Design a protein around this motif. Sequence first.
Motif, PDB file in Angstrom:
ATOM      1  N   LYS A 291     -28.074 -24.079 -85.422  1.00  0.00           N
ATOM      2  CA  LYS A 291     -26.875 -24.931 -85.355  1.00  0.00           C
ATOM      3  C   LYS A 291     -25.864 -24.647 -86.429  1.00  0.00           C
ATOM      4  O   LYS A 291     -26.237 -24.435 -87.572  1.00  0.00           O
TER       5      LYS A 291
ATOM      6  N   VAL B  86     -26.289 -36.641 -86.127  1.00  0.00           N
ATOM      7  CA  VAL B  86     -26.228 -37.730 -85.159  1.00  0.00           C
ATOM      8  C   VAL B  86     -27.463 -37.746 -84.242  1.00  0.00           C
ATOM      9  O   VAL B  86     -27.980 -38.819 -83.927  1.00  0.00           O
ATOM     10  N   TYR B  87     -27.898 -36.578 -83.768  1.00  0.00           N
ATOM     11  CA  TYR B  87     -29.033 -36.539 -82.841  1.00  0.00           C
ATOM     12  C   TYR B  87     -29.818 -35.274 -83.036  1.00  0.00           C
ATOM     13  O   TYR B  87     -29.230 -34.194 -83.054  1.00  0.00           O
ATOM     14  N   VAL B  88     -31.127 -35.393 -83.252  1.00  0.00           N
ATOM     15  CA  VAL B  88     -31.949 -34.199 -83.401  1.00  0.00           C
ATOM     16  C   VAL B  88     -32.559 -33.920 -82.023  1.00  0.00           C
ATOM     17  O   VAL B  88     -33.322 -34.730 -81.521  1.00  0.00           O
ATOM     18  N   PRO B  89     -32.214 -32.800 -81.400  1.00  0.00           N
ATOM     19  CA  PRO B  89     -32.776 -32.492 -80.077  1.00  0.00           C
ATOM     20  C   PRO B  89     -34.297 -32.507 -79.988  1.00  0.00           C
ATOM     21  O   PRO B  89     -35.015 -32.118 -80.939  1.00  0.00           O
ATOM     22  N   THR B  90     -34.792 -32.919 -78.822  1.00  0.00           N
ATOM     23  CA  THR B  90     -36.224 -32.928 -78.564  1.00  0.00           C
ATOM     24  C   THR B  90     -36.738 -31.502 -78.301  1.00  0.00           C
ATOM     25  O   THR B  90     -37.900 -31.167 -78.630  1.00  0.00           O
ATOM     26  N   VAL B  91     -35.892 -30.676 -77.619  1.00  0.00           N
ATOM     27  CA  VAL B  91     -36.337 -29.342 -77.250  1.00  0.00           C
ATOM     28  C   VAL B  91     -35.343 -28.255 -77.684  1.00  0.00           C
ATOM     29  O   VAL B  91     -34.190 -28.555 -78.038  1.00  0.00           O
ATOM     30  N   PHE B  92     -35.814 -26.988 -77.658  1.00  0.00           N
ATOM     31  CA  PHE B  92     -34.976 -25.855 -77.998  1.00  0.00           C
ATOM     32  C   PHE B  92     -35.085 -24.884 -76.786  1.00  0.00           C
ATOM     33  O   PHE B  92     -36.206 -24.589 -76.362  1.00  0.00           O
ATOM     34  N   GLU B  93     -33.955 -24.414 -76.232  1.00  0.00           N
ATOM     35  CA  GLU B  93     -33.996 -23.521 -75.055  1.00  0.00           C
ATOM     36  C   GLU B  93     -34.232 -22.075 -75.556  1.00  0.00           C
ATOM     37  O   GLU B  93     -35.363 -21.577 -75.517  1.00  0.00           O
ATOM     38  N   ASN B  94     -33.176 -21.438 -76.081  1.00  0.00           N
ATOM     39  CA  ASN B  94     -33.264 -20.156 -76.781  1.00  0.00           C
ATOM     40  C   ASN B  94     -31.961 -19.993 -77.591  1.00  0.00           C
ATOM     41  O   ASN B  94     -31.056 -20.851 -77.506  1.00  0.00           O
ATOM     42  N   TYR B  95     -31.852 -18.891 -78.336  1.00  0.00           N
ATOM     43  CA  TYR B  95     -30.659 -18.637 -79.110  1.00  0.00           C
ATOM     44  C   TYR B  95     -30.705 -17.167 -79.490  1.00  0.00           C
ATOM     45  O   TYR B  95     -31.791 -16.598 -79.573  1.00  0.00           O
TER      46      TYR B  95
END
Lengths: 244, 178
Positions: B25, B31-40
């Motif tokens: 990131k 504000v919000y910590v994502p539950t999942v990570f797709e790719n990067y």
Amino acid sequence: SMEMDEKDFAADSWSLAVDSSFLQQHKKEVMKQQDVIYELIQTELHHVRTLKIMTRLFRTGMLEELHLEPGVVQGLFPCVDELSDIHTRFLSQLLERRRQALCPGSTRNFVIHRLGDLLISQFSGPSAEQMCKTYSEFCSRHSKALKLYKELYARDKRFQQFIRKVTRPAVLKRHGVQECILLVTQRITKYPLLISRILQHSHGIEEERQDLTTALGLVKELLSNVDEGIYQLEKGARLQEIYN
Amino acid sequence: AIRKKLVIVGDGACGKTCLLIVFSKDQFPEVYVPTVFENYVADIEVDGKQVELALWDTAGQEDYDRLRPLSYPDTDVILMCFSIDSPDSLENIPEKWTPEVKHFCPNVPIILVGNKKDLRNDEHTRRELAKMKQEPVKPEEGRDMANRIGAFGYMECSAKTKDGVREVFEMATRAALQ
Ligand SMILES: Fc1ccc(-c2ccn[nH]2)nc1
Ligand SMILES: Fc1ccc(-c2ccn[nH]2)nc1
Ligand SMILES: Fc1ccc(-c2ccn[nH]2)nc1
């Protein structure tokens, strides 16, 4: 994806997507629940978009521009039409639930209070049997698809120019052929993580807590069946290697 | 730029998803910590070399032994994670995670990473662990485990404060290039 849905899911969270004067009217627990539901829908919109890159950009482009031997494109993109139908229908249901929940006069302010029933429907009956059969086939064909891709990229000049051309735009940076295949395989194991966190913030209505608990159990049963139904196919594998 | 692939492995709640989110990131998630990570796909320049480093998470695949290995083809570097507030996550490293990664990723460098280093001096953490005759993982315990499993190296970081995060991914890029 289409512009209307991309804009509706452009923000990093539900609390940043809605108007601040609307956010202010809700308790923190509702905000936490809505942020995770928003992430489930946003990642489902992105997953359907990954399937459209596979079907429309790669698959159809290879059929229309390249002279690949028959059965080669199917080997690179196993089950993509079936996967697109399953997830586009599921995404349509999620987006219609959000749309019906909008306040009159708004295209952004909504609260989804009843997600559990939609998840039970998706992960039970014929739709669950179709997801089970399709991911068992897809994930068993995953290694073979990556090897076929690597072979074609190394030996075929026109295939290499085609891949380099269609994956050049910055918006395709994370979505090459091999990246799309693993994004699809990994999608199904994201669902329990998302549902568990939605359930953690859905205790206010007992019917909803029970429905999300039933949905989580159905998703885990589906994943267990898919995992038990996988055996990697290998091009040119001999019968002796399989039965041993 | 040459393309390399990184995969992070470790128990659920070892903090692997948070580590990928904070590194990838542009601004820290306040504000919000994502539950999942797709790719990067990270653009990294390390020691004068430019690399496109594709990042992948195994979160959600820990219970599924036939789906999980599909994340490993053509991996160039493995981050093997444990949480410093969980001595149990460190115990699962040598006889669960290590033989699996060595089987599917032979000759791929493994960096053992101790996550949540900020909890080593957190009072609530020390109290909760003391009830089970335990304490936060000590730096020498992490180094000795990394030495034992044949890791390329041992590193620590905190996704919460970002300390050590950039260094982990720059070192992973150097390991992938070797
Ligand atoms: F997103 C889509 C969906 C379908 C198609 C399509 C089907 C037949 N021709 N074109 N194109 C883009
Ligand atoms: F920051 C968080 C908090 C909870 C979770 C969670 C709970 C169950 N599945 N995932 N994930 C990230
Ligand atoms: F030495 C090992 C350890 C694990 C595995 C494994 C894990 C999942 N599938 N296969 N195979 C060999």
